[PDB]
Amino acid sequence: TIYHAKDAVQATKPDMRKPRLVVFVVGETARADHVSFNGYERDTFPQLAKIDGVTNFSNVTSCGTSTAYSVPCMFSYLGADEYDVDTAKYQENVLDTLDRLGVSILWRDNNSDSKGVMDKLPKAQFADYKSATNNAICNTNPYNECRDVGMLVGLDDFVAANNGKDMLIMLHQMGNHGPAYFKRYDEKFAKFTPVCEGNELAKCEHQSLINAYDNALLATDDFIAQSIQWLQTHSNAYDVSMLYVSDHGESLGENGVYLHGMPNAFAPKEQRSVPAFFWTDKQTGITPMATDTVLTHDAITPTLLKLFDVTADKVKDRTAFIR
C-alpha cells in the first residue's frame, strides 16, 4: 500500500457531536445533458425536483469514460492528471482513510464490483446486490433483474448495528448501463415510447434508443429520491447527506458512436459530461458550492472528507462539491 493521507485527522468525533450518515450513490452511464435541471427537453428527474435541499451541478467532467477507469479515480487522492488506473488498487484511497479513522464503510453493489476500491477492507463491508441472496427487489420485471432500490432494504439494520458511529454507505448503481437500456427500469418508468429492444444499437430508430435511455433515468430519479427519503428517517439522530455522481456518460449515436469507453484523448464530450447531485439536511451545516462550479471527479474525495470533518494535506486546497 502506497499511502497519501497518513496525516488525516477527524476534528470532531461522534461521541461529542451528532453522528454523520451519508449515502454516496455511484451512478452509471448517466449523461449531464439528459437531466431536466441541466436544460434537457424532458422531465427526467421529477421526484428529485420535489425535494428541498438538492443541488444540481451543471458542469462536472468525469475522470474517464469507463467503469474500470473512473470508479477508482473517484475515490483516489491523486486526481485525474496523476491518476494511474494500473496501480490504483495499491494506493490508499479515501475509503481506506475514513475507515482507519473509525467511519463505518459499507459498499452495496448492483453493478459489478467496486473495481478494487474496497479490496483492502474486510470483505464483510462489500455486498453483492445483483443476486437475490441479498436483493429482495428482482421479480418486478420480466427479466427478474435486481433493482437499485433493493440496495436500500435493510439499511436500518446496518444503522442499528453501527449505533452512534459515523457511517458512509456507497450504493453502486446498475443505473443506465447499456446496451440493453430497456431492461434497466420497471414498467412504471416506461414513460417514453416506443423503445429500442435490441443489442444492435445503430440498427435501432434513434428516437426509440433515446426513449429507452430516458426511461432508465426515471428509474434512477426514483432510486435517488428513495435514498434521500430513507436518510430523512434518520435526520434527528444523524446529520444526513446524499452525494450522487455518475462514473461517466454515454454516446447515443453522435458521429456514429455508441456506448462508452472511448480513450480520453479522443473521447466525445457526451462520454465525460456527468450529472452530480448533493442533498443535505438543514441541521448539518453543510453548504453546497455554486451550482455552476467547474467540477470534476477530483472533487469527490475532498467532499467525502469534509462531510466527516476530516482534513488531509494532499487535498487541503482542492475544490469540493461543498464548502
Cβ-proximal residue to Au ion, closest one: 67
CB of 137 to Au ion, least distance (A): 21
Residue selected from 38, 44, 67, 97 as contacting Au ion according to rule CB under 5 A: 67
* 301 membership: H or E segment, kind and range: helix 300-307
Going by C-alpha positions, the residue among 189, 106, 179, 192 that lies closest to residue 147 is: 189
d(CA 166, CA 159): 10
Span near Au ion by CB under 5 A; candidates 60-68, 76-84, 184-192, 275-283? 60-68
Select from 56-64, 95-103, 243-251, 286-294 the region that touches Au ion (CB under 5 A): 243-251
Q: Which listed range, 3-11, 21-29, 220-228, 233-241, lies at the site for Au ion (CB under 5 A)?
A: 21-29
Distance, CA of 166 to CA of 306 (rounded, Å) = 13
Instruction: Name which of 31 and 314 has its Cβ closer to Au ion.
Output: 31
Q: Which is nearer to Au ion, 135 or 271 (CB)?
A: 271
- 74/240 with CB nearer Au ion: 74
Place of cell 424532458: 42
Tell me how far, at minimum, the Cβ of 210 lies from Au ion, in Å. Answer: 19
Site for Au ion in 25-44 (CB under 5 A): 28
- What contacts 24+ positions apart, CB below 8 Å, involve 256-265? 256/202, 258/178, 258/179, 258/201, 258/202, 259/178, 259/179, 259/201, 260/29, 260/65, 260/66, 261/65, 261/66, 262/65, 263/65, 264/64, 264/65
28 annotated as belonging to a binding site for a ligand: yes
Binding residues (CB under 5 A) for Au ion: these are 28, 67, 247
